[PDB]
Amino acid sequence: GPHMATGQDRVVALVDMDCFFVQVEQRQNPHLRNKPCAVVQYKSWKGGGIIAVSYEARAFGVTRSMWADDAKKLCPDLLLAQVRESRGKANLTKYREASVEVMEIMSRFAVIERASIDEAYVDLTSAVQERLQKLQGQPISADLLPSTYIEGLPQGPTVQKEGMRKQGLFQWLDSLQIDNLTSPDLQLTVGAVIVEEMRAAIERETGFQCSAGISHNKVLAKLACGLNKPNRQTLVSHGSVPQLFSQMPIRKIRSLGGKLGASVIEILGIEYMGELTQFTESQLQSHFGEKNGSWLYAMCRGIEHDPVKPRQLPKTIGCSKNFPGKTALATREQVQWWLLQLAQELEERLTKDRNDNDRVATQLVVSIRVQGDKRLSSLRRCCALTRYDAHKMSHDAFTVIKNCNTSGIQTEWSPPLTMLFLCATKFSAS
DNA sequence: ATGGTGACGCT
DNA sequence: AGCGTCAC
Numbered sequence: 001g002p003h004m005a006t007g008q009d010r011v012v013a014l015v016d017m018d019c020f021f022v023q024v025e026q027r028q029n030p031h032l033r034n035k036p037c038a039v040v041q042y043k044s045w046k047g048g049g050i051i052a053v054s055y056e057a058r059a060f061g062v063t064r065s066m067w068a069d070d071a072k073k074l075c076p077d078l079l080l081a082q083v084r085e086s087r088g089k090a091n092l093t094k095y096r097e098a099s100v101e102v103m104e105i106m107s108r109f110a111v112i113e114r115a116s117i118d119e120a121y122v123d124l125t126s127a128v129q130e131r132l133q134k135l136q137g138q139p140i141s142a143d144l145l146p147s148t149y150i151e152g153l154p155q156g157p158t159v160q161k162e163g164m165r166k167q168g169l170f171q172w173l174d175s176l177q178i179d180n181l182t183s184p185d186l187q188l189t190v191g192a193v194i195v196e197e198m199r200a201a202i203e204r205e206t207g208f209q210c211s212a213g214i215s216h217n218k219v220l221a222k223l224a225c226g227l228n229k230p231n232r233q234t235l236v237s238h239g240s241v242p243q244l245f246s247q248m249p250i251r252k253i254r255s256l257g258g259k260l261g262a263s264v265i266e267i268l269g270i271e272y273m274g275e276l277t278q279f280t281e282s283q284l285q286s287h288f289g290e291k292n293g294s295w296l297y298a299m300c301r302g303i304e305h306d307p308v309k310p311r312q313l314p315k316t317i318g319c320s321k322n323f324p325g326k327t328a329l330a331t332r333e334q335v336q337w338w339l340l341q342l343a344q345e346l347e348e349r350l351t352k353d354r355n356d357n358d359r360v361a362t363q364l365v366v367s368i369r370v371q372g373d374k375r376l377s378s379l380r381r382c383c384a385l386t387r388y389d390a391h392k393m394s395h396d397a398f399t400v401i402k403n404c405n406t407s408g409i410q411t412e413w414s415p416p417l418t419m420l421f422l423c424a425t426k427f428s429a430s
Numbered sequence: 431a432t433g434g435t436g437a438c439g440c441t
Numbered sequence: 442a443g444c445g446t447c448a449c
């Protein structure tokens with residue numbers, strides 16, 4: 001009791017852009033605003049692969065990974081924006097640049113951890129402590145939280161979404177202990193006021209809307225973020241965790257959406273995150289390893305210690321292309337031409353990175369797939385990256401992979417190559 | 431024949 | 442080092 005850590009020591013937010021690549025295209029092209037629309041890559045094969053989908057198009061059943069020809073069957077008026085193609089491949093520069101817009105804004109508020117192209121964690125603990133000193137025990141108006149949901153409320157003793165949101169917010173604020181600066185719930189609430197300001201800045205300065213979660217750790221903030229997406233933010237308090245977890249499928253928690261989470265379900269015979277509380281730490285460690293068992297034991301109680309890492313920039317800059325089915329690369333000339341395309345895009349991105357960010361990459365990782373292997377990568381080889389030169393990079397890549405070629409005949413490639421990937425890594429200051 | 435990414439863990 | 446998992 002008096003020695004039981006409750007994992008209420010930090011205020012962490014996760015900001016996640018709404019339908020991000022679609023909003024980038026809608027900002028650019030006003031004709032796509034407030035329409036069913038999707039972003040597609042590669043138009044020739046079944047109208048292109050959908051990679052992002054506006055909320056209006058989601059209502060028709062359009063999803064990511066669908067072919068656009070198929071999505072048009074569900075939504076005949078779907079509008080499409082296509083990813084740029086340069087050097088024979090999809091080029092994601094525009095989305096990378098839009099991501100820097102958002103991340104630079106967020107960084108004004110707090111140090112961020114870039115978790116993906118469209119989301120960042122924020123450790124707001126310090127900012128909250130400072131704002132609590134100005135909010136000199138004065139209560140927090142609902143007007144300061146105009147887009148905030150308090151998960152689990154309203155509860156206890158209006159049939160529209162906004163009415164429910166407000167009732168829940170009022171319950172929460174009416175019970176809050178504003179005179180106590182160390183109250184975790186108070187800290188979260190001030191965290192949420194800060195996130196409202198951050199989200200308004202993002203929208204004002206970019207035109208982009210986003211969702212956010214506010215809780216005491218990354219996993220709860222991420223989970224919270226998705227509860228009321230789009231264009232809303234969600235506060236998940238420590239106290240909300242038992243009910244929230246009681247019906248929360250295990251696969252919804254970050255890192256449990258794959259084989260480990262499946263093994264939790266299978267081995268333990270459970271379905272919901274809350275059901276984990278019934279195992280000892282040692283029991284969990286015995287099935288899932290020391291690190292995972294300890295993490296699960298705490299996480300099912302709403303407790304996690306993973307810090308928000310101070311890192312705004314990607315640690316790797318990579319370029320890849322798949323060559324599926326019959327397009328697989330079967331000649332040495334093909335392999336070299338495409339290694340060069342990749343190397344050229346990579347050179348351009350690396351040169352810009354070095355000018356903007358005062359660093360240089362030092363290692364080149366070369367990864368390939370051969371026809372017939374059913375693993376993402378078949379083979380990964382590193383070499384030194386000593387010059388930002390596409391012909392050098394492409395020549396070196398070829399050098400480190402050429403003995404994969406089981407062909408006797410000189411100019412053929414066997415088995416043919418279904419993927420090429422160049423990744424610049426091991427950055428140093430410059 | 432979603433594809434083109436990116437972070438991190440294990441041995 | 443090279444392989445694997447998990448995810449946006």
Ligand SMILES: Nc1ccn([C@H]2C[C@H](O)[C@@H](COP(=O)(O)NP(=O)(O)OP(=O)(O)O)O2)c(=O)n1
Nearest residue numbers: 016017018019020021022051052053117118449
């Ligand atoms: N498999 C995936 C997942 C994401 N992305 C890109 C396109 C997305 O717009 C963007 C962000 O991913 P996301 O957050 O998973 N989804 P998105 O922002 O489109 O919609 P929301 O559900 O977040 O509103 O990354 C991708 O290209 N391939």
Ligand SMILES: [Mg+2]
Nearest residue numbers: 016017018118
């Ligand atoms: Mg998003």
Ligand SMILES: [Mg+2]
Nearest residue numbers: 016118119449
């Ligand atoms: Mg995201």
